[PDB]
């Protein structure tokens, strides 16, 4: 049998893009290989659009006592329109199962919205052979009440692929372990603060390597 992802939750990233967050609940059904992301406009003549990314399930199997949570962006959206979003899981037998759809989400213009604080990203802690720890700071001014958390973007250095994303909740966080990562591998990392309504400019892009097996 095959257990579906939860409906994605949406935050606005820019005038033309959003971040989606979902889970797969702990279950003994078939493994998921990838997820696909779909969106559709609420309104006229409207069909489901599929984005080009194949989001890999990754490892480990579960990242909590509840399931495994995932973060992914959808970009190139038309501003000032209402959308719905859903996630489709592809299983190890090549079948697929879609989440319930999100709530209607109006893509706001940024004029009424307040600038978010840009994290200042410190050197990447070369933590272990399979993990790295990001550290950052917030400028003195920063209205931390504005922040729900941080979105981290990372990929192998020089890779042309899309960034992987991860979510860390809590305005007060100032560090985050990214794991599991490939061993002896150079990654590039950038970080933004986010709220439901928006997200900061990016930190500097920082490079950091997992450890080399001795």
């Amino acid at each position: 049998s095959t257990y579906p992802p939860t409906p994605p939750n949406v935050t606005r990233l820019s005038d033309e893009s959003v971040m989606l967050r979902w889970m797969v609940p702990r279950n003994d059904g078939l493994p998921i290989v990838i997820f696909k992301v779909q969106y559709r406009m609420v309104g006229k003549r409207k069909n489901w659009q599929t984005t080009n990314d194949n989001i890999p399930y990754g490892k480990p199997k579960w990242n909590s006592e509840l399931g495994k949570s995932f973060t992914a962006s959808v970009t190139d959206l038309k501003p000032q329109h209402t959308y719905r979003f859903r996630i489709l899981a592809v299983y190890s037998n090549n079948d697929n199962k879609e989440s319930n759809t999100s709530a209607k989400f109006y893509l706001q213009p940024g004029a009424a919205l307040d600038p978010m604080p840009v994290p200042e990203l410190l050197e990447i802690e070369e933590y272990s052979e399979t993990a790295v720890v990001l550290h950052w700071s917030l400028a003195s001014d920063a209205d931390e009440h504005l922040i729900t958390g941080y979105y981290a973007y990372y990929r192998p250095s020089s890779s042309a692929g899309e960034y992987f994303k991860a979510t860390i909740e809590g305005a007060h966080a100032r560090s985050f372990k990214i794991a599991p990562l490939e061993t002896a591998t150079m990654y590039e990392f950038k970080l933004q603060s986010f709220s439901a309504a928006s997200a900061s400019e990016f930190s500097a892009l920082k490079q950091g390597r997992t450890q080399r097996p001795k």
Binding site: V33, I34, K36, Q38, N47, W48, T50, N52, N54, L88, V90, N93, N94, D95, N96, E98
Partner: protein, 132 residues
């Protein structure tokens, strides 16, 4: 080569556009001067739930027929229907002979591989394919 998911389309764009199945045309009737061009497919390894199709439709439907059998030895392709291109013979609605809806995403991928110009995973019941 991932299978398609529900509502996915390859190539990832509109049906009637260029890079896909190209433009719509004349709706073919019994009286139509076109009607003589719609060919029957008497491939024995394709199940029909109808036999009358366009020329390119047959070409690709035959490769897919033997591709299905190739991917799954002993399985057969099922054509369930032959304002879209159905009245022109240029679109098919398909499934598998064993009715394994879990294969449909895979079947969709096989229709792309088999060289259909535009494949659409329209429902859990069946896959839509078309040619230019």
């Amino acid at each position: 080569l991932y299978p398609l998911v529900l509502k996915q389309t390859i190539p990832n764009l509109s049906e009637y556009t260029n890079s896909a199945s190209g433009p719509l045309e004349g709706v073919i009737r019994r009286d139509s001067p076109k009607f003589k061009d719609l060919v029957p497919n008497y491939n024995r390894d394709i199940l029909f739930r109808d036999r009358l199709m366009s020329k390119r439709c047959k070409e690709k439907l035959n490769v897919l027929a033997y591709s299905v059998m190739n991917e799954w030895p002993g399985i057969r392709l099922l054509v369930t229907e032959s304002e879209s291109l159905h009245y022109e013979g240029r679109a098919v609605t398909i499934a598998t002979s064993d009715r394994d809806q879990s294969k449909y995403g895979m079947l969709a991928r096989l229709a792309v591989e088999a060289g259909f110009d535009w494949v659409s995973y329209v429902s859990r019941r069946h896959i839509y394919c078309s040619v230019k």
